[PDB]
Amino acid sequence: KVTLADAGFIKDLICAQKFNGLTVLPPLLTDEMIAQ
């Protein structure tokens, strides 16, 4: 139901955000440890 965005994988507005000093740090807990 929730449509996220801005994955920002290395090679969109996300790429333009990448090329100007704006970075997205990935979370510490993944999507499976939360489920566990």
Partner 1 sequence: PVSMTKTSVDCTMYICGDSTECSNLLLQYGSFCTQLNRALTGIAVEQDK
Partner 2 sequence: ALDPLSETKCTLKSFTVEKGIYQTSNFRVQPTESIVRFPNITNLCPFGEVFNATRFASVYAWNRKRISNCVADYSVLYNSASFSTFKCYGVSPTKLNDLCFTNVYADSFVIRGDEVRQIAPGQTGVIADYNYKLPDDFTGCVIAWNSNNLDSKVGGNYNYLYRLFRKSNLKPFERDISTEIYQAGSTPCNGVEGFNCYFPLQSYGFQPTNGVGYQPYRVVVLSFELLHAPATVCGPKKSTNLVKNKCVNFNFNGLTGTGVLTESNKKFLPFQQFGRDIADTTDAVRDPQTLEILDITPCSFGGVSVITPGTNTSNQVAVLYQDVNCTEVPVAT
Judged by the rule CB under 8 A, the positions of this chain that interact with partner 2 are 8, 10, 13, 16, 19-20, 23, 25
Buried b (16+ CB within 10 A) or exposed e, 1-36: eeeeeeeeeeeeeeeeebeeeeeeeeeeeeeeeeee
Q: Which is nearer to partner 2, 2 or 7 (CB)?
A: 7
d(CA 14, CA 1): 21
| Binding-site member from 28, 31, 33, 36 for partner 1 (CB under 8 A) | 28
Residue 29 interacts with, from partner 2, partner 1, none (CB under 5-8 Å by kind)? partner 1
Return residues touching partner 1 (CB under 8 A). Answer: 6, 20-29
